[PDB]
Amino acid sequence: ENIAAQMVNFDREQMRRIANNMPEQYDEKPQVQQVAQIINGVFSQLLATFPASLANRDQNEVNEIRRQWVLAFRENGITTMEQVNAGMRVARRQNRPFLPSPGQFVAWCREEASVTAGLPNVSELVDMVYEYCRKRGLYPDAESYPWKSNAHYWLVTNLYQNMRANALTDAELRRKAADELVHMTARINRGEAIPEPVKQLPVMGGRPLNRAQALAKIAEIKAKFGLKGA
């Protein structure tokens, strides 16, 4: 479109577009210094936990490992120190002398955060999904399933629908379960109220009719409407 039309509209409206005005607020981002300090603290605490990990290694390998950890944390979004503390607790629970991979540490942090929010971990969620996939054909609807809590219902139904629609494999199912757990934990930590399904209609019933009365009704209908063929 030509600028002339917009300018003519601006001249015709003037104060109307001033009422429209322009959205405010800009973009603010954290500095690299905070991320560097977080990475240094994580590295120091891990070296304290696993002193033998960097034994017999030059500074170049240490710098490369630090760069890899920085990249992994930036990709996975490690900002709060509470996640770092949870990961350190999980690592102190772990019994492997060697230094864990950054992805494993991120998984530990996410798993501990999910467990803190009163939700099952990835393995329990996957087992529940498998049990649901085996047993849900025996119930009239998803709301008739014996659900423990609303979070279980939503997680299981969402994972089942996603898996059936996208033909997910086992590893893809586990990754989706981890993502769903992260999202549900984030929602729970933000307060929020989990809805109580939707339900679908009552069952009705109450049909106390026998064979003889039904035959009498059919005969009466035939007599009234003159259905000679029947």
């Binding site: 600028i3 002339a4 300018m7 322009m22």
Partner: protein, 453 residues
């Protein structure tokens, strides 16, 4: 008859349905004509009425008249050729039975292919028939005749990729270019002027048919600098300037342009806290723009290179050329076929942009994003390798400029308010850093009046 298929293979290959679809699409849509014109010719049509219709439509298109059903029928009626074609009844049948909402490119290609195959078969038949009946011709004459007949098939193109040219024509064109450049003293600006002295010194303006990439980290004035260049090009040149905005709407761009041109604080305009002087400045700017009226903006999202090229061609046809093209930004452009691989999509986008720039003989400035790892380096001034996932962008770009502000990363920067344009790849000149002054309050770039080292 008495022929299911025994006499059905004397018929040369053809497709009536594709011809009718193309003619109907042209009748019910006159915007796609060029797409039809670049794929089919009047001699690709098997039936005389279709050739006549296509020729008349081409004549009307060249004369500027619309090529709808009514106008075409009237034009044929005046020349007395309506009866020969098949009548207004046949014209209406073609217009109606053939849908408007169709892809005419496929039918045009189908029409093109059958004509080539049929002409090749006919030429082979003629060659064999001449061979069996020499009629006094020698072997050399027959071979020359066969060669001419065979190569006359791929020939007969109206005007499309004229091909190799003798050194004489290219030398004449180069002499004409040199004379035209010298006849206009612009103090070393042999191209689209940018309005900045040092930038014009280092780059000699924005040369036509070049791919120009502007790259910067978020919050660096990349969009502001691009808009300043667009405004300078529009003010200093009379050719139209086209803008593609895949991120911000056109209204915000217009408000930013008004603020930059009138040097009115953006906060007051965004809050509506203006006064009489601001109104006078805005009115003067709008009067100047109405005097020019050489800027066009398209704010569609997810634009493919084909749509961009088509719209640029349409604008050039409507207003006799383009002065500059601006795209913000290239990463938002989508290639449906290469959506699976990002690198191939980026390479296709860069190649299409370079091809468009070369075709239109206009400078095309596309905006790009850098990698976040740049922020982790000791020096945050961008380099070419900071264009990761876009090696083809570095390869195919004539000019690459990085916008840098040390004030963004350093609060106590000694160069506060000073921005650097770093020339990563200057194809036809030297490389270096050009210093400018950045006014984010007015959202503008100005010449650096301070001392230069």
């Amino acid at each position: 008859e008495r022929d299911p298929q025994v006499a059905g293979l004397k018929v040369p290959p053809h497709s009536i349905e594709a011809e009718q679809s193309v003619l109907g699409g042209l009748m019910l849509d006159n915007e796609r004509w060029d797409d039809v014109a670049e794929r089919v010719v009047a001699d690709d049509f098997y039936t005389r009425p279709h050739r006549h219709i296509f020729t008349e439509m081409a004549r009307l298109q060249e004369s500027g008249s619309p090529i709808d059903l009514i106008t075409l029928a009237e034009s044929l009626e005046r020349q007395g050729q309506l009866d020969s074609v098949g009548g207004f009844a046949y014209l209406a049948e073609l217009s109606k039975n053939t849908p408007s909402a169709a892809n005419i490119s496929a039918y045009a290609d189908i029409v093109r292919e059958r004509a080539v195959v049929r002409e090749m078969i006919s030429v082979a038949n003629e060659i064999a028939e001449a061979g069996f009946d020499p009629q006094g011709r020698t072997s050399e004459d027959l071979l020359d005749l066969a060669e001419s007949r065979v190569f006359k098939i791929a020939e007969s193109r109206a005007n499309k990729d004229e091909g190799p040219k003798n050194i004489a024509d290219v030398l004449d064109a180069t002499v004409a270019r040199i004379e035209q450049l010298f006849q206009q003293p612009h103090d070393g600006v042999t191209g689209v002027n940018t309005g900045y002295d040092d930038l014009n010194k280092k780059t000699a303006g924005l040369q036509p048919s070049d791919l120009i990439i502007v790259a910067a980290r978020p919050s660096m004035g990349k969009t502001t600098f691009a808009m300043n260049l667009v405004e300078n090009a529009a003010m200093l040149q009379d050719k139209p300037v086209l803008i593609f905005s895949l991120e911000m709407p056109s209204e915000q761009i217009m408000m930013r342009s008004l603020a930059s041109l009138s040097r009115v604080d953006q906060t007051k305009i965004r809050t509506g806290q203006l006064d009489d002087e601001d109104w006078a400045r805005i009115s003067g700017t709008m009067g100047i723009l109405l005097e020019k009226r050489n800027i066009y903006i398209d704010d569609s999202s997810g634009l493919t290179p084909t749509e961009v090229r088509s719209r640029a061609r349409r604008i050039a046809r409507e207003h006799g050329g383009i002065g500059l093209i601006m795209i913000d930004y290239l990463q938002l452009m989508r290639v449906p076929a290469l959506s699976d691989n990002r690198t191939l999509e980026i390479a296709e986008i860069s190649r299409s942009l370079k091809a468009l720039a070369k075709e239109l003989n206009v400078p095309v400035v596309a905006l790009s994003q850098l990698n976040r790892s740049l922020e982790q380096r000791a020096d945050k001034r961008p380099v070419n390798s900071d264009l990761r996932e876009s090696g083809s962008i570095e390869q195919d770009a004539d000019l690459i400029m990085f916008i840098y502000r040390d004030e963004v990363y350093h609060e106590n920067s000694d160069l506060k308010g000073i921005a650097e344009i770093i020339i990563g790849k200057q194809r036809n000149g030297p490389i270096g850093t050009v210093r400018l002054t950045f006014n984010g309050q007015w959202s503008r770039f100005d010449n650096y009046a301070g001392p230069q080292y």
